[PDB]
Design a protein around this ligand. Structure first.
Ligand code: CA
Ligand code: CA
Lengths: 110, 223, 223
């Protein structure tokens, strides 16, 4: 795949699914370009046929995220779950990982 | 369809299956010679199967008609999926009966909260793979454009609507693409994309058909 | 900055942008050769941009000076953001003028209730994402220590101060870190962290500059 992991894989619902990773990137994948709207938001424009794979961040989503205010920031989800995401390195339940990247999406909207 | 139920055989007479060897997308019969589906479901050769229930067993009421014309919306964007709509003209007209019928185009856009019916032969599991032989049905409401863009920041164009449940558990999935979202007898949406399937605060995204009625009619008249 | 207003071109002459290819943090010029920012903004390579207003458009009044030294506080705690302060020595003295000016250090600590000016180029949305091209400005009061501790139970040290509104709506956000908080012409805070952005009962937490004047002065004199 054109990506090791992708937090925001936009995938069609056909068989098989046609996906594209919308994760913002900086250094750049085969073709790197700008995301709709802000041309400052670079993304890999490579599409892939099939399951997108794992999510880069340590949580599927997070309601209680505490982060530094740099961009990208570093965040730690204090959400208490019955089981962490397979991407969480340390699951003590709660995931103590401190992920550097976009702010995690909320599980519950507000 | 994840978290839905088996539709009563032929109770969704406008639902069609797009096949090129096997089922890969859904579609909606809107005219005896025209089917509307998702542009990303495009293939140079498509066979439309109408009056289907169990796609794996010949039951008698099926009609296999090949696509004579396949027209993807001229502004369709494969990366953003904006304008994900396509029209298929059948090689021969479809015989209309109680099991094969047309569905109406929208007379006006659906308002947030409108209860709709979504159907298809797509994946029924949000985790793994489980493809059904029988058409699945789902009752789901159209969501406000606000919570939609909230769920997909910077990804929702004016031609997309979110239909489903923000808490997850019920949504369309792989194999349902191009299929129908019907509300009060009107085709308001076409299964298009989404982050995974039935995920929390991640509803399905659909082509906003009410914005394509003009394109649909002019194309049909010109072909 | 969420809920603020666009500052007037070059009206915040001590505000700088930390760019490593893209803008990622703000800073404050306190010396013709020194900039103060947040420790978590550290990078081995950093370029300081002063005289900036619109970071996406060359305007003629900006100065691009690369960092020659980047000194993080020895007691910085990566897991709690305690002692979140850093000093950058420019490779060449910045040219001081009306657009590029220094901001004085605190003579003593700011009292609760004191109104301050928080500025930067960080996000402006409390839910979605919208990064401004023009420098944003915000008027906010210093919150009491008791109020800071209650909203952030067990996470506030003596080297941190909350600044903003308990009602949420206005506050700093991603992209502002390292940025200034000036009150009556004195740097009293540095954008550091918080629970979300402009959220209710989650005011911004800032590094308390009135605890580090000696560290700053001694570090500058010894480097
Ligand atoms: Ca059959
Ligand atoms: Ca400029």
């Amino acid at each position: 795949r054109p990506w090791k992991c992708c937090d925001e894989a936009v995938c069609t619902r056909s068989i098989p699914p046609i996906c594209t990773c919308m994760d913002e990137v900086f250094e750049c994948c085969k073709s790197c370009g700008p995301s709709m709207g802000d041309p400052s938001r670079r993304i890999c424009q490579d599409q892939y046929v099939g399951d997108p794979g794992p999510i880069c961040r340590p949580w599927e989503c997070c309601d209680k995220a505490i982060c530094t205010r740099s961009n990208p920031p570093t965040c730690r989800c204090v959400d208490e779950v019955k089981k962490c995401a397979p991407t969480c390195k340390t699951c003590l339940r709660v995931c103590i990982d401190s992920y550097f990247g976009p702010v995690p999406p909320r599980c519950t909207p507000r | 369809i994840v978290g839905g139920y088996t539709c009563a055989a032929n109770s969704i007479p406008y639902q069609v299956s797009l096949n090129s060897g096997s089922h890969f997308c859904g579609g909606s019969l809107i005219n005896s010679q025209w089917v509307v589906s998702a542009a990303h479901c495009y293939k140079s050769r498509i066979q439309v199967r109408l009056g289907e229930h169990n796609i794996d067993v010949l039951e008698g009421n099926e009609q296999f008609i090949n696509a004579a014309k396949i027209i993807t919306h001229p502004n369709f964007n494969g990366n953003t999926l904006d304008n994900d709509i396509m029209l298929i003209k059948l090689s021969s007209p479809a015989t209309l009966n109680s099991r094969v019928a047309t569905v109406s185009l929208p007379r006006s856009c659906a308002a947030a909260g409108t209860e709709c019916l979504i159907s298809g032969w797509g994946n029924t599991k949000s985790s793994g793979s489980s493809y059904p032989s029988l058409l699945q049905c789902l009752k789901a409401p159209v969501l406000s454009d606000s919570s939609c863009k909230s769920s997909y920041p910077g990804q929702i164009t004016g031609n997309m609507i979110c239909v489903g449940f923000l808490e997850g558990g019920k949504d369309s999935c792989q194999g349902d693409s191009g299929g129908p979202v019907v509300c009060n007898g009107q085709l308001q949406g076409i299964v298009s994309w989404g982050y995974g399937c039935a995920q929390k605060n991640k509803p399905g995204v659909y082509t906003k058909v009410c914005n394509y009625v003009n394109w649909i009619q002019q194309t049909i008249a010109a072909n």
